[PDB]
Every structure is written in C-alpha cells, then in structure tokens.
Paper text:
Nicotinamide phosphoribosyltransferase (NAMPT) plays an important role in the biosynthesis of nicotinamide adenine dinucleotide (NAD+) via the nicotinamide (NAM) salvage pathway. Here, we demonstrated the NAMPT-mediated salvage pathway is functional in the Gram-negative phytopathogenic bacterium Xanthomonas campestris pv. campestris (Xcc) for the synthesis of NAD+, and the enzyme activity of NAMPT in this bacterium is significantly higher than that of human NAMPT in vitro. Our structural analyses of Xcc NAMPT, both in isolation and in complex with either the substrate NAM or the product nicotinamide mononucleotide (NMN), uncovered significant details of substrate recognition. Specifically, we revealed the presence of a NAM binding tunnel that connects the active site, and this tunnel is essential for both catalysis and inhibitor binding.
We obtained two apo structures from two types of crystals, namely the tablet-shaped (1.79 Å) and diamond-shaped (2.08 Å) crystals. These structures had almost identical overall conformations (RMSD, 0.3 Å). The NAMPT monomer consists of 19 α-helices and 18 β-strands, which can be divided into two domains, domain A and domain B. Domain A is a typical β/α barrel that has a letter-C-like shape, which is formed by a five-stranded β sheet (β6, β7, β8, β11, and β12) wrapped around by 11 α helices (α7-α17). There are two molecules in an asymmetric unit of the Xcc NAMPT crystal, which assemble into a compact and stable dimer that covers a surface area of 4140 Å2. The dimeric structure of Xcc NAMPT consists of two protomers arranged head to tail, with domain A on one protomer interacting with domain B on the other protomer. In particular, the open side of the C-shape β/α barrel in domain A packs against a four-helix bundle in domain B to create a complete active site. It should be noted that the active site is not entirely closed but instead exposed to the solvent through two openings: an entrance situated directly above the active site and a separate lateral tunnel.
Numbering used by the authors:
A (entry chain A): 1 to 394, 406 to 463, 465 to 468
B (entry chain B): 1 to 275, 284 to 430, 435 to 468
The structure:
C-alpha cells in the first residue's frame, strides 16, 4: 500500500486549495460529526481508532510535499506548499488538531455529536478541513457496527423467549461471510472488525488482522471448517454420501462443529437419506455438531423444512421453556439474509416450536457492502471559526460536545460551556482520543464489546 | 498497511480447511468469472491488474506460514502447513496459477467468460480456490467502470446531436467526488481509477496514485478549485458577496476554470434582483432544488446575465459559464437533464455531472450479478464438469468445463466457448499472470483506448 503512503493526498482535490477560502483573520476552526437520521434510530460508534492509526501513521515530510505539490499542479489544484512546509519545519510534521469522540462501542441516538475536531495552531488552523475526507469515512465502520448491533438485538429477543442459554448462544448467531462481496481488502478488514463489536463468528480473516493490529486483540473471532459446493460436486453425484462422510472423517470430533452445504443435488434427500439414515450413527458416534446449510429455495421456508426433516432423523429435546432443541445437528442460513428476513425465519421456526438455538445466520455483502454514507445520513460539519480573536458560530452551532445523563443514560448534544453549568445530572460523554500527533485514548476490542451494555 | 501483508490470510477462514475436501486423485481445477446480468447488458472489464499487483506483491515466505499457522489454529481452522511449505521450498513461494482475462477496458456483453483461473501444479492444485475471495473482488472495479462507461454512452449521444465538439467535450462530463462516501482508502483508489477508464475529471486523489503505480500513468485525471458552501457561510450573511468575490480573485485567471456552489435562490437574486474580466470559465453548481428542473432554470438565468452564442448544430452555448449538477445524479436522472436542456435548445456542452457515493459505494456484487465458479476439475486423470444440479443451481452457473472467450472475426461479437471445441474467431482472452509473473500489463492509455472504442 506504499503507493498510498502520503497523507497530503488522502483528501478530495478541492481541499488542496481550500485554505484560501476562509475569511481574513481566521484563527481556528471547529467541526463535529453526527448521524442526521436514516435507517436506524441509533448508531454504534466504532472504527475511528483504526482510521487514525492507519491514515495518520507518521510525520509529514518534505518529500510528501514535493510529490503532492507536483501532482496537484498538473492535476489543476493550487496547494499550500508554504503552509505544509511550516507544519514540517515548525511542528515536526505532526498535525495540529484535537479529536474528541464517544467511547467506541457506545450506541448513541441519531442527531447527536459523535466526534469533534478542532485546530490547535493559529497559523495552521485549516488542517481539520483538509482531513474531512478521510475522517468522514468513519461512516462505514459505524454503519456496519450498527447493522450488526441491530441484528444482535433481534436474535437476543428470540433467544430470551425460547432458549435455556440465550447469552451463551448469542455471540455465534450472525457469521460474517462478506470478504468476497466487499469492495476492497481494507474495507473487508474494517467492516469485518465492525461486525466483531457484536459477534464472535467470522470468516473474514482480515478482520482478525485489523483487530490484532489496532484493537489489541490477538484472536478476535472464530470459525469452523465448512464445505463448498465445488468440493462436494467434484466427487460426482453418485458419491455425494462419500463427500459427506469425508467431511466427518476430516473434521468430526467430540465437541467439534462442522458445516456442510447440503443442496448440491437435493437437500431433502440429503437430509432424509444421506445424513439422516446412512451417516446418522457415524454422526452420533462422532460427538460433533453437524451444521446443515441450505443454499437455494425460499430462505424462510427451507429453514423450517430443514429443521422438520432433521427432527425426524435425529430427534430433539424439549428445553426449560418448552421449545425443541435438535440432537447433534443445526442449520445455518446464509442465503437472502437481511434483518427483515432474519426476523422472519426466527418468527417462523419458534412458532413451529423450535428453539432459536437451532439456527444461525450468515450475511455477506448485505453486511459489508450494501451500506452507504446515506444509510445513517452521516455528516461532518463546521460549527464555529475564530476570526479576529472571537469565536463565531457557522442548526447545531458553536463549540459542541456530547452529554450523558448519569441517572437515565440519555444522550444529548450541548455547547462546551454547559459541561460546567450542567455538571449536575450530566457528564461530558466525549473523551479526547487524539491530539497533535499523540493518540491519547486507546480501546481494546474487549472494552468496545462491553460498551456495545446498550439495549433497545 | 503492513498488518495485512500476508497473502495466506487474504481469504475466507473456511478456505484454510478446503483442500481436505476434494476426492482422492484430484490434481487440477478450473474457474471462470462472468456477469450473470443485472442492471446493464454489458460490462467494462477493469481492475484485475491492480488487484494482482497489490494482493500478490511478493513470494510467500516461511514467516507467512508461521503467522498463519498460529492464528488459524486459535481461530478454529486446520491449516495445510506441508502444502504451503512445499510451495515456498519447491516453487519459490510463487503461486502456481494461470490467469487469463479479456484486455482491460474491453466491454463485453453479460453472460460471457471475462477471466479464467487454472491450476498449474499437480500437488498444489487447490491454490486457485484459495484465491477466490481476493479475486472475486474484481467485481468492484468492473462494476464502477461499467457504471461510468454507461454514463459516457448517454452523454455521447447528446453531445453528438447538439455540440460542435462532441469528443472534445465528452471526457470532462462526469466528475467523481466519491472519496468521502466510499468505505475505505483502497476502495476510493481502485473505484476512482475505474471511473478514470472513461473520464478525466476526478476529485479522488487516491485514484491518481493508483493509476500512476498500477497503470503507469502519472497524471490520470484533472480537477479545479471549488468553493465549499460552509466556508462561504463563515464570512457571515452580510459578507456573502465578499466570500464569492474572494474565490475569483484567488483562483480566476485567464485560462482558468473555477467552481462556485450556491443555493439556487441566490442565483436568482444575483441575476434578477442583482445582488467576464478575468477570462476564466466559471462552473456554477446549484445545491438546492430538483436536479432536472434546477439545471434548466440555471441555464435560463445564466443566459440572461451572460448571453450565449448559437453553435453549428443550432444550439445555444453560454458565455463564460457552465453548470454542473452533482446532487441526485444517477444514470436515469442524468438522461432526464439532457433531454430537458436540449429540448430547451441548449447544447450538451453547457452542463456537466458529478457522482459521489452513487458511483463508488452504491454498487455491490449483485449489481452485475458477478460470479466466479469452479467449472471443471481433474480427478483420477480425467477432467470432469463441476456443477450443482439445475434444480438447486438457481441459474448461478451457466457454463461447465474448460472455457474461453472468443471474438467473432466477421462481426466483432463476443461469445464463450469450450476450450476442447476451439473457426473464424480469435481467442479474446490473454494470459495476464502465471506462476508469479505478470505476463501482460496495460497502461491506462491502452485501457482507455479499449473502452473508448466500445459503443452502444
């Protein structure tokens, strides 16, 4: 990625000449980030720590300026060469900004300050605006973390009603399969880590690498061996049961979990005859759990059909809450899953008397790629500048922060002046996470996961 | 950055388990890529060269294996340590695969082979499937290049009918400003470069860096200084005319082009309520109103204040001023604008378009139904077709066997064909990459030539 290792070019073109647009005598600038609404009423704030670590990873250099000046000139943009040289020569190439943010993992209602960015040097007051492009991409990890968090609340509800161990089951019920469906490796890593705020199951190895490098977590998630259509069908139709038996031979051990896509030829026959008759005793003797995966048919209907046929072959127990738990086998549905279809499946199977323990869900592109900056109407806005020594407002206005009520937990946005006058009942909910080149507050993924305490 | 620098972990977790699942006697695999349909009936192939240069940038090493071995064990996957050590020790850490692709920039109807991947080593025959995750993300640059190419064909049609210089105007008519609305820096670079296949205007500086590093083109695109609305709002309402005045004295010079943003109502007051010498062209961007209506109204008002000349086709061309619409632009609304303004008698010269998230982010793997399928394997010395039964395949695999793409000599038409059958057609794929060596590479100039030659 060394070709992209120049912070001065990690911006929109027109920002190269933007400093010339401020009023004469401008001395400082203040910006905030918020969700202005969208699909969900609240957002799980995540990813700013990774953005800052990766995008601002070294001092700016004179060679950075040389390359940027030449490229921008031929590209058609003026460039503040003298201003950047001053940052290199006088400020050590460190950016004079202060960033404050709500602790990552907190879930905050929309229309609220989530981050603020302020200039810390009078001559280089324009730096916050230069960083708008790379900082506003925080919309992506926030939105993925929010989608994942919203799904977690849905599953938790049905597990509460129908399972004897809701919180033991819950972290494995949404599995991220989206690395092939997202637009970049870097997006897979950050989007996948955003899912891991809420769940433990992932096939996005890049998310483990980002969690290890940026969130102090050596092993942030887990997965299982799983068959693909192409390995099954390479055996030939006549050897479908041998392909399945090989999955057991390689991977079925006591306590192990193994997923097998079972619709290469006919999933009803696969369950009734191959798994449920020919291989049944081998599965029982393995001590393993076999997870059946449909990959065709109506997503809701086929999950219920699978549970019924698996029940007929393997039996069930009834749990403390009166719901059936299949013996030795589970179902995972990755096809056609969104929060609406996921809730529909859970509604269908619990109404048929099956515990939500029996099923798990996969999302791929619907989680990592079918999100955009408008999903939660993300915005980064200038709220105040200092001109001739006086702070001037630029409907949210002035130097702002986020407050949290100590008794109710409710959030609201406020002027910084009111942290003192409202020291009763409310605390400042933002913390300073980055200032003048120094990251000042780091979270572990464990801490982020603890914050994501939020229910609704 | 460096935390993602291990090709062995740039895959889905279950791919670590995958080689154990093939039948005894397997020793080759074959894969093809196609678009199965979707929004558009043809796709511009672009981006594989950047994916290969960045994702496979060095030989695999023993250190890579040690790191992958330890993480995957903790994560829950088996790992083919011996197979990877053999690749490092016997094959120099070079991946034993052959990739063939249509030359980048070529535009191919859907339902056609665009790429094939085949194993080249009998022991390491499982390597192509291991790379499926990172290779399938070629869907993204192909899809962005396709959206941009489809916009180019619409604008081309209207310029041919109403402009005296269609091909001179065309490359500046769609401007990318998606860098803040895309999910990561890497996606901004690769998606932004996909737009540069068709057009010259971009605010995505990351795309310039990728075009230079991966497509050998140091200055691939251009932009102009542009007023930020909120910075103008920082001068105070009583000095808003002062703010726009500053914009021109800083940037407006003879051959220059400068953009000013404005609320549509203030364009009215400026010309009808009353609220040329620099030699520059000023491009006005309205920020309010309906996209089709407001562009027509701006042209009418601007005609009042600046006048126009009639070109050789009979259409009015404004003096000194142009209009760019960057709000609400998608291919359908862009065509509605061109219909309206040309019905009003204005040449397509007068207007340009911007797309942001709508170009770089609001696309997914389903936009062009992008597929990568294993279509054949060799087992016990015989090549066999690989496929799900038609009743469960749901149309996702249209082809079987070892395949290529042909170009008809008489008609220039593309069609897909079995390699064993391959008469008045030439093979349209070239071998771009084999066993660690990039065998055919393109400059962006060549890519653009391919795409610009394609029509409809």
């Amino acid at each position: 990625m060394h070709y992209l290792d120049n912070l001065l070019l990690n911006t929109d073109s027109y920002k190269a000449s933007h400093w010339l647009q401020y009023p004469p005598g401008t001395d400082a600038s203040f910006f905030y980030v918020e969700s202005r609404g969208g699909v969900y009423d609240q957002t799980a704030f995540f990813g700013l720590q990774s953005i800052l670590k990766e995008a601002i990873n070294r001092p700016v250099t004179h060679a950075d300026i040389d390359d940027a000046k030449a490229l921008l000139a031929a590209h058609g943009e003026p460039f503040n060469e003298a201003g950047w040289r001053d940052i290199v020569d006088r400020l050590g190439g460190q950016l004079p900004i202060r960033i404050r943010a709500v602790p990552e993992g907190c879930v905050v209602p929309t229309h609220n300050v989530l981050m603020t960015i302020e200039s810390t040097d009078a001559k280089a007051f324009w730096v916050p605006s230069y960083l708008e492009t790379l900082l506003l991409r925080v919309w992506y990890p926030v939105t993925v973390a929010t989608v994942s968090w919203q799904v977690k609340q849905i599953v938790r509800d049905f597990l509460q009603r129908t399972s004897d161990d809701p919180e033991g089951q819950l972290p494995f019920k949404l599995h991220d399969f989206g690395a092939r469906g997202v637009s970049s490796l870097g997006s897979a890593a950050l989007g996948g880590a955003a899912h891991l705020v809420n769940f433990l199951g992932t096939d996005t190895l890049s998310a483990l690498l980002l969690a290890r490098a940026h969130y102090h977590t050596p092993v942030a998630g887990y997965s299982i061996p799983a068959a693909e259509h192409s390995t099954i069908t390479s055996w030939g139709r006549e050897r479908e049961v041998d392909a399945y038996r090989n999955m057991l031979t390689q991977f079925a051990r006591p306590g192990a979990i193994v997923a097998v896509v079972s619709d290469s030829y006919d999933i009803y026959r696969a369950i009734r005859e191959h798994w449920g008759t020919t291989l049944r005793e081998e599965i029982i003797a393995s001590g393993a759990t076999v997870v059946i995966r449909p990959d065709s048919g109506d997503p809701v209907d086929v999950v219920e059909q699978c549970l019924l046929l698996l029940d007929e072959a393997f039996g069930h127990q009834v749990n403390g809450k009166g719901y059936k738990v299949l013996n030795h086998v589970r179902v995972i549905q990755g096809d056609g899953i969104n929060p609406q279809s996921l809730r529909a499946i859970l509604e269908r199977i619990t109404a048929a008397g099956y515990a939500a323990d029996n099923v798990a869900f996969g999302m791929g592109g619907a989680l990592l790629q079918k999100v955009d900056r408008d999903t939660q109407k993300f915005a980064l806005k200038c709220s105040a500048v200092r001109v001739d020594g006086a702070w001037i407002d630029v409907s949210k206005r002035g130097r702002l922060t986020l407050l949290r009520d100590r008794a109710t937990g409710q959030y609201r946005s406020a002027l910084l002046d009111e942290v003192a006058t409202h020291a009763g009942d409310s605390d400042d909910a933002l913390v300073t996470v980055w200032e003048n080149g120094q990251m000042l507050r780091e979270w572990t993924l464990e801490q982020v996961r603890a914050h994501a305490a939020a229910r609704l």
